[PDB]
Amino acid sequence: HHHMPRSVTADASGSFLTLTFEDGSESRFHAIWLRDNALDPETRSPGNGQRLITIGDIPADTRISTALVDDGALTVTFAPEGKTVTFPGKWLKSNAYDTDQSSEVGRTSPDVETWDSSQPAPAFDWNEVQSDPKAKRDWLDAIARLGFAKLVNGPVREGALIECASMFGFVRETNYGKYFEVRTEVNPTNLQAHTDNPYRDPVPSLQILYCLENSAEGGDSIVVDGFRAAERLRDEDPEGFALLAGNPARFEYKGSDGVHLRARRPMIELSPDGEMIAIRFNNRSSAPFVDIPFEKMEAYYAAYRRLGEFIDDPEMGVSFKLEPGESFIVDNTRVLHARLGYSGSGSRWLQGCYADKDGLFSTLNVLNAQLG
Amino acid sequence: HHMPRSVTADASGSFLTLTFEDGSESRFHAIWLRDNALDPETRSPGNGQRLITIGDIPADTRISTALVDDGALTVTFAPEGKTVTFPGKWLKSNAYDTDQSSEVGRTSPDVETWDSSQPAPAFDWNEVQSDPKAKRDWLDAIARLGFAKLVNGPVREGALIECASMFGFVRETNYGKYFEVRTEVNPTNLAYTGLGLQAHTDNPYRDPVPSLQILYCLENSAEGGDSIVVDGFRAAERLRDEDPEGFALLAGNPARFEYKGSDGVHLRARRPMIELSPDGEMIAIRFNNRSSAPFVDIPFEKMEAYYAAYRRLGEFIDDPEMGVSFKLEPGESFIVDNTRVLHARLGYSGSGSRWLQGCYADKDGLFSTLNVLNAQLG
Ligand SMILES: C[N+](C)(C)CCP(=O)(O)O
Ligand SMILES: O=C(O)CCC(=O)C(=O)O
Ligand SMILES: [Fe+2]
Ligand SMILES: [Fe+2]
Numbered sequence: 001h002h003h004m005p006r007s008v009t010a011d012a013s014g015s016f017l018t019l020t021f022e023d024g025s026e027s028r029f030h031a032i033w034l035r036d037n038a039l040d041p042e043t044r045s046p047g048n049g050q051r052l053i054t055i056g057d058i059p060a061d062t063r064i065s066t067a068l069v070d071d072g073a074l075t076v077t078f079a080p081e082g083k084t085v086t087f088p089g090k091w092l093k094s095n096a097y098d099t100d101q102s103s104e105v106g107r108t109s110p111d112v113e114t115w116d117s118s119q120p121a122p123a124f125d126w127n128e129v130q131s132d133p134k135a136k137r138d139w140l141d142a143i144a145r146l147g148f149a150k151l152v153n154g155p156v157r158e159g160a161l162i163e164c165a166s167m168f169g170f171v172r173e174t175n176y177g178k179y180f181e182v183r184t185e186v187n188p189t190n191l192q193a194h195t196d197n198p199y200r201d202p203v204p205s206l207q208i209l210y211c212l213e214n215s216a217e218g219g220d221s222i223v224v225d226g227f228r229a230a231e232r233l234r235d236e237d238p239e240g241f242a243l244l245a246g247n248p249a250r251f252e253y254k255g256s257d258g259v260h261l262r263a264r265r266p267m268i269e270l271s272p273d274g275e276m277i278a279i280r281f282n283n284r285s286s287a288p289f290v291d292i293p294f295e296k297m298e299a300y301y302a303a304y305r306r307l308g309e310f311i312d313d314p315e316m317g318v319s320f321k322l323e324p325g326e327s328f329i330v331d332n333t334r335v336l337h338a339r340l341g342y343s344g345s346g347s348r349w350l351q352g353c354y355a356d357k358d359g360l361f362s363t364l365n366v367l368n369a370q371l372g
Numbered sequence: 373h374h375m376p377r378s379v380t381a382d383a384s385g386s387f388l389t390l391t392f393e394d395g396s397e398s399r400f401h402a403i404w405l406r407d408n409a410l411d412p413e414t415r416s417p418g419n420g421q422r423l424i425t426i427g428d429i430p431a432d433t434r435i436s437t438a439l440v441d442d443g444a445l446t447v448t449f450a451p452e453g454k455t456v457t458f459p460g461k462w463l464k465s466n467a468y469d470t471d472q473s474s475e476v477g478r479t480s481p482d483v484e485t486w487d488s489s490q491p492a493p494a495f496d497w498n499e500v501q502s503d504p505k506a507k508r509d510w511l512d513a514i515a516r517l518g519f520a521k522l523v524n525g526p527v528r529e530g531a532l533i534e535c536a537s538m539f540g541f542v543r544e545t546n547y548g549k550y551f552e553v554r555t556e557v558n559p560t561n562l563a564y565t566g567l568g569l570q571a572h573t574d575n576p577y578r579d580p581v582p583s584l585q586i587l588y589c590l591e592n593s594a595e596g597g598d599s600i601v602v603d604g605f606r607a608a609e610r611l612r613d614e615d616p617e618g619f620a621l622l623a624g625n626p627a628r629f630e631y632k633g634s635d636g637v638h639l640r641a642r643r644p645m646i647e648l649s650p651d652g653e654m655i656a657i658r659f660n661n662r663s664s665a666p667f668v669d670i671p672f673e674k675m676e677a678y679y680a681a682y683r684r685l686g687e688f689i690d691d692p693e694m695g696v697s698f699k700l701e702p703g704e705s706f707i708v709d710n711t712r713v714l715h716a717r718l719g720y721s722g723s724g725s726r727w728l729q730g731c732y733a734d735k736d737g738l739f740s741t742l743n744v745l746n747a748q749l750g
Contacts, residue, residue, distance in 0.1 A: 015676070028672055030672075030675050030676055030679070032675075032676065032679045033666075033667070033675060033679070036664075036679075037666050045562065047558055047559065048559060048560050048561060048562070048633040048634065049630075049631075049632050049633060050561060050562045050633065050662040050663065051661055051662050051663070051664065052562075052662075053661070054570045054661045054686060054690075055661065055679075055682055055683050055686045056570075056683070056686050056687065056690055060683065095666040095668055096668070097666075097667065097668050097669070097670060097671075097672060097675060098672040101669060101670075101671055170543075170544040170545060171544070172541075172543070172734075173541040173542070174541065174737075175541075175737070175740065192425050199736075200734075200736045201583075201735070201736060202580035202581070202583060202734070202736075203580070205580055245650060246650045246651070247650060247651055248649050248650060248651060252420075253419075253421070254419070254420045255418075255419040255420070255421075256418055256419055257419075258740075258744055259740050259744075260739075260740050260743035260744060260747070261736055261739065261740050261743075262739070263736075264649070264653075265649075266649075266650050270650070271626055271642070271643075271644075272623060272624045272625060272626060272644050272647075272648075273624070273625060273626060273669060283422055283424070283425040283426065284421045284422050284423075285421060285422070286422055288408050288466040289404065289468065290466055290467070290468050291468070291472065291651060292468055293468070293472060294399055294401075294468060294469040297401050297403075297404055297468060298386065298401055298403065301401070301403045301404065301407075301426075304426055305426050305427065305429075305431065308425060308426045308427050309427065312425075312427060356543075356580060357579070357580075358578045358579055358580065358639055358641075359545075359546070361639075361640070362546065362637055362638050362639050365638035365640070366635075366636055366637070366638055369638070
């Protein structure tokens with residue numbers, strides 16, 4: 001009834017129509033938008049959903065000739081083509097644009113929930129996510145909503161992290177390989193939270209860390225929600241937030257290992273309509289900020305410092321241990337990671353790799369369709 | 373020019389003003405200079421990585437003294453009592469008090485736009501893999517121009533992967549490590565048909581978008597099947613200059629993209645057709661008629677004007693004077709910066725067969741390979 005069309009009027013111009021639903025709500029649709037979004041077999045390929053026409057193919061003077069609501073659907077005929085198409089009621093309501101578009105600068109998407117140290121680490125079973133699609137769905141949904149999740153009871157096997165990535169997507173291969181070794185000896189001698197690779201564009205969007213061996217005390221993994229840090233800055237200091245979102249920083253890795261990577265991106269990235277979409281924060285690979293005008297540099301640095309203070313706040317960190325066979329994924333466009341200090345001697349062997357979020361969301365979409 | 377003549381410090385100690393030998397002035401803040409110190413306690417000698425956090429620098433950091441000497445600036449910071457030296461060349465190269473352009477929709481200084489008046493740049497398969505100069509020049513052409521042909525290559529399946537391996541790494545996707553561009557029954561995508569394709573960037577429904585694409589010819593014996601490339605930055609520039617409001621609509625509102633071409637895949641993205649940096653520099657173009665999804669993020673009162681701007685951009689992209697056209701022969705390929713340069717093909721039919729192979733790679737690898745080659749060759 002929210003989605004059941006009742007009636008329609010076409011404007012005298014034919015430039016738009018106004019659809020009334022059974023609950024009394026109205027939604028206006030332009031002729032050009034309706035024509036471009038026609039769902040019939042000659043606009044959208046039945047076999048693959050690809051649109052068969054370009055914007056150039058649609059006559060510039062396209063108008064609604066006539067329209068009618070009947071049996072839960074809208075019939076519309078366009079001029080000058082003479083093309084008649086029908087739209088289900090549910091589709092029109094779901095794809096409506098005649099609505100109040102939220103414009104709040106720095107807002108998070110409704111699909112994510114921000115967190116601090118009160119958030120327990122989401123934890124899922126390695127075997128369950130492979131054999132139970134509901135478990136797999138919930139695992140990937142946790143990564144989508146919260147930006148991280150643990151996988152426990154996995155195999156103590158080299159390269160197992162690559163198998164984890166392959167459950168939903170594909171590894172971003174780099175000059176270090178499809179995965180890399182993180183070996184640590186801790187002894188008396190003795191042998192900040194960040195996002196990885198802000199000097200890569202596009203940034204690798206997921207990171208996996210997988211434990212094979214751990215005999216050292218302490219050194220718990222920590223995750224910090226970049227969106228929560230940014231939210232706190234926005235609420236306290238909107239001008240400071242605007243500075244970090246409104247000017248690009250520079251990142252560079254120029255090692256002796258034959259990799260020289262640079263990127264020009266802001267530390268807080270917004271969509272053009274103000275939604276917070278990414279965080280880049282890494283002290284080790286920050287490079288000279290050449291793009292910020294002189295008049296803003298002092299205040300930019302003050303805001304940068306303040307963001308760092310929120311990131312350094314121990315009340316923001318979620319900490320956990322990785323036993324052999326355990327791993328975690330972070331959304332590397334949002335959630336920062338680090339570890340706590342070691343409190344005892346021993347050895348550690350982790351493996352690390354990157355994967356991409358587009359594959360994760362596709363797999364999640366496919367699972368939601370299969371389960372719903 | 374990069375030789376410092378003299379320096380003054382502000383009363384607060386918050387910045388200094390450096391005057392060079394050509395009369396030019398550049399101001400540098402105390403905090404920015406301290407944060408960019410090049411000494412072994414701020415930057416690693418081994419890899420150049422920064423050894424401090426922003427929190428480690430005292431909040432009241434200020435210039436206690438500054439002097440010019442031997443073509444360099446020596447500065448002491450309070451309260452650390454830390455003295456560092458910056459070469460004049462470094463200060464000039466990394467200056468931010470430069471009156472940076474705020475022209476909305478300007479391109480990066482490192483790119484050069486083009487239309488049909490420039491013939492396609494071409495490089496040789498054997499030369500780029502055997503001569504480091506040729507490799508550098510090839511990769512640098514892709515970096516600057518967003519497009520290059522690689523000719524005289526082998527007529528061998530999977531040769532495009534060897535091409536990718538010359539500079540970087542394959543972005544493997546749902547479509548495969550590489551994909552077969554040929555007519556398929558029950559096609560999952562109109563790329564796999566005999567139909568002509570409007571100029572487009574691949575996978576605007578994928579976030580992150582693949583940043584490079586390789587297209588490699590094995591057979592092209594049918595009538596038609598010509599390749600065309602269009603510089604999306606040139607198209608965007610033309611819209612910017614002709615119609616500022618239209619340009620602003622396409623840069624300032626997200627579009628939607630969606631691919632659901634078979635069971636087992638559902639890719640969606642929410643990104644503008646013209647992506648700008650927050651300071652107005654052009655970053656990326658996303659344009660693909662086949663996978664543009666319903667635009668739900670544009671206010672009702674702006675939708676008609678948005679569509680008019682979209683139409684106009686399409687007219688620039690379809691303009692034959694913007695397209696660089698060629699027909700690939702067996703063993704020839706090209707690479708596009710898939711964030712910038714659009715590609716197209718004319719439909720094909722009749723006697724003959726067409727078989728291209730395609731894959732994605734990433735620019736970060738290309739830039740690293742190029743950067744390393746530039747260090748080694750000069
Ligand atoms: C891999 N592919 C079928 C060539 C993609 C074409 P797009 O859907 O990106 O236009
Ligand atoms: O067939 C061609 O020349 C190009 C097809 C294409 O656009 C693609 O494979 O992405
Ligand atoms: Fe890391
Ligand atoms: Fe394509």
